[PDB]
């Protein structure tokens, strides 16, 4: 249940001292990451988020205006060009605001939801670095919603649904939500805060969620709610956040023309579901103990032969399965069949398709799983259909149950 | 045909002084980028490349080892943590080698093809920066092939085929190819260079490709092939390259077990087809004059209502086409039909569907293009099928073209 151990065993990634806290993603691990990306993008489509890409670094003046120079300075990597200082972005928010600021906005453009897979770098102390979980370089499932006050509640409700949606896909249904309210001194009026906090609380109660209050624990720039998922070992992972920000749009001069034809400053909401996607991959790796749901599995199927008499057939099948959109490898080496089955079982390949002479003759495949199950002889097209359903549904469970 | 002007007009991207030579990708431009990524990935699957992800920065010792400190010093951004100096990667190659070095390799693993969409930063002079074409931050369609000497030709052959495949998808059939051979002093033996040069030349000849020798223009580390496409204006763009490297693997201690069980150093091939993908997007933007082929179009279909009375209907179509994997938006605005048609025509939306009362009654859609071709009233499923065929084939031309 160490994601580093499992990571090494499955050849997912590795890290080096020449890049502390920075992941080298191998093919398989990167495949997992990319499937994560695909899922998130399906959610972005469904929930109507734009997807953008911000610049890797921006001028120091900008990060002064945002407040990062004051409150983020030690965490930021600085580099320079032509007598100008630049910070490598710890956060994607200012870039998103910069994109928002291009072109005149009106209320008709709101709510505006803007998402990115944001590459962030934070100069974390080397001694605090652990695996995929505490890192220097990472990617957030980051987004920002620009809306009217009147929209806030609805949008919050939208985020809440998204959270419980996404977590549910991974089999985390035990979730604790904490609402952090105003500190003694804050940006924004008492009224704005009453409205926002009430929006959060009501949004939660409409979803029937018994949230816990953290009183006075909100940031100076806004109130927030945070989502903590419990894994199979019942250990808590704080992942998702919905955070109101009154500081950012004002400092970056974001505005829109109201329905009353006057200048308004947009309400801004930071939202993330997974948080660091690397960290989330670690969490999943430990939750599943290396058995990834077939949709997330780097290699979904391994087709093997007894002798070379089946080699050809195997190859055929392989191409076929690859054409059907399945990640499939052929294992042709001369080794005993049990040998192959054991090796790929330890690699946590969801399905192993064995081809002997009878399979070739009958145009079938003998189906086995990493759980040690014999699924018996099966029609190839049937197998492809079932695998395609398992993947498309992102089912947590394999065949036969 | 200025890609910057069109870029602004289509809301693809923007750039600011606080991030010189670094792109803010808006939603539509990023949609284009991601589509390019999808294409490239289909290619990686077909031509059998791994896809990995390297760290964004590595310590200065590595970059000294590779030779970047000696030859690339002024072009590298540097930053520090805990009294250790790091370079933001100008190239993805060393990271790929670092990944290669994890686990024992034998001749059975060769050829090993490793690709990445590699985010690179180079500190170019500010005076040289132009649009998407000359930038500080870019992404290469980078790959490296680790092979034996005997494999070189074959692999080079694969690369050549890849190039001509990919270019032709975008409608570039006119390609000039240059072969650069040994300079007066170089890394690697006369025999190594004989063999590599012969491999390149014969590779080109067997594909029936006329080419020109640039003598002594090869890098000190290896001979190369370069690919220059010509656009519809007959302008030359150098994009693709296949580059032998005799330097990198020995400097980074890359090795594999040979058939003789003796330690061998693998041959390395840098290959890139598009080169900078930002630059390639500029190039395509100008080639198509902002009329992107349907598969590349950020918004493929806009569905408009004449009045409120069709709104519902429009929505329903919008979901349908959306579920069919089409990028579609609904224009429900309280504006005249001609207003909408004009805006979406200026946006170069390939297909404008109009729903009047007739259409709601008949279950059809009025179909017209950005070229101002009236395709008239068509059954929805027909339109869907046709659009899907146009997208899957990545067709250059629209319906009735
Ligand atoms: C410069 C300030 C730093 C702040 C004081 C650091 C605190 C530790 C904490 O408040 C950060 C926080 O919760 O950020 C959280 C983010 C959201 C996802 C997880 C967390 C994440 O990314 O880590 C949200 C805020 C981003 C905020 C801004 C921006 N830009 C603010 O306008 C700006 C005033 C923040
Ligand atoms: C540190 C050295 C820099 C080199 C001398 C700079 C020259 C201007 C030129 O030779 C670069 C070049 O052709 O790189 C090209 C790349 C390929 C695609 C476009 C070009 C690209 O990325 O621009 C290939 C070489 C990468 C090389 C290495 C690495 N690592 C070498 O082992 C190392 C010795 C290179
Ligand atoms: Zn943010
Ligand atoms: Zn390279």
Question: Care to describe what's here?
Answer:
Chains A, B: TRNA binds at residues 72-76, 122, 134, 221, 243, 306-308, 334-342, 348, 354-359, 368. Chain A is an alpha+beta fold. Chain A folds into 2 domains: 1-289, BirA Bifunctional Protein, domain 2 (2-Layer Sandwich); 290-401, Rossmann fold, CATH 3.40.50. Helix content of chain A is 35%, strand content 26%. Chain A has 13 helices and 20 strands. Chain A has an 8-stranded mixed beta sheet with strand order 3-7-8-15-12-11-9-10. In chain A, strands 17-16-18-19-20 form a 5-stranded mixed beta sheet, with helices on both faces. In chain A, strands 4-6-5 form a 3-stranded antiparallel beta sheet. At the A-B interface, strand 2, helix 2, strand 3, strand 4 and strand 5 of A face strand 2, helix 2, strand 3, strand 4 and strand 5 of B. The structure holds ligand 2CR (2 copies) and zinc ion (2 copies). Residues 66-68, 71-72, 91, 93-94, 219, 221, 241, 243, 245, 247-248, 270, 272 of chain A line the site of one copy of the ligand C[C@@H]1C[C@H](C)C[C@H](C)[C@@H](O)CC(=O)O[C@H]([C@@H]2CCC[C@H]2C(=O)O)C/C=C/C=C(\C#N)[C@H](O)[C@@H](C)C1.
């Amino acid at each position: 249940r160490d994601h580093r151990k499992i990571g090494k065993q499955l050849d997912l990634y590795h890290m080096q001292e020449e890049a502390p806290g920075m992941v080298f993603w191998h093919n398989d691990g990167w495949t997992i990451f990319r499937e994560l990306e695909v899922f998130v993008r399906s959610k972005l489509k469904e929930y109507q988020y734009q997807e953008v890409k911000g610049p890797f670094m921006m001028d120091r003046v900008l990060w002064e205006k945002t407040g990062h120079w004051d409150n983020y300075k030690d965490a930021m990597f600085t580099t320079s060009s032509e007598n100008r200082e630049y910070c490598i972005k710890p956060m994607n928010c200012p870039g998103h605001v910069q994109i928002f600021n291009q072109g005149l906005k009106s209320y008709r453009d709101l709510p505006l939801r803007m998402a990115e897979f944001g590459s962030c770098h934070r100069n974390e102390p080397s001694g605090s670095l652990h695996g995929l979980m505490r890192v220097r370089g990472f990617t957030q499932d980051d987004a920002h919603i620009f809306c009217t006050e009147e929209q806030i509640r609805d949008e919050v409700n939208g985020c809440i649904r998204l959270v419980y949606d996404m977590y549910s896909t991974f089999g985390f249904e035990k979730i604790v939500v904490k609402l952090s309210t105003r500190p003694e001194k804050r940006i924004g009026s008492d009224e704005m805060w009453d409205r926002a906090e009430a929006d959060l609380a009501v949004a939660l109660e409409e979803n029937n969620i018994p949230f816990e209050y953290q009183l006075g624990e909100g940031a100076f720039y806004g109130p927030k709610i945070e989502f903590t998922l419990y894994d199979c070992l019942d250990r808590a992972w704080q992942c998702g956040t919905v955070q109101l920000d009154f500081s950012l749009p004002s400092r970056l001069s974001a505005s829109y023309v109201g329905e009353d034809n006057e200048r308004k400053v947009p309400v801004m909401i930071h939202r993330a579901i997974l948080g660091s996607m690397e960290r989330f991959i670690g969490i999943l790796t430990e939750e599943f103990a290396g058995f990834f749901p077939t949709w997330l599995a780097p290699v979904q199927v391994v087709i093997m032969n007894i002798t070379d008499s089946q080699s050809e057939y195997v190859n055929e099948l392989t191409q076929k399965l690859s054409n059907a959109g399945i990640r499939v490898k052929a294992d042709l080496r001369n080794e005993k069949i049990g040998f192959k089955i054991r090796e790929h079982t330890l690699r946590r390949v969801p399905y192993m398709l064995v081809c002997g002479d009878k399979e070739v003759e009958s145009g079938k495949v003998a189906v086995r799983t990493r759980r040690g199950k014999d699924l018996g002889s099966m029609d190839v097209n049937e197998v492809i259909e079932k695998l395609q359903q398992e993947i498309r549904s992102r089912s947590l469970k394999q065949l036969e149950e």
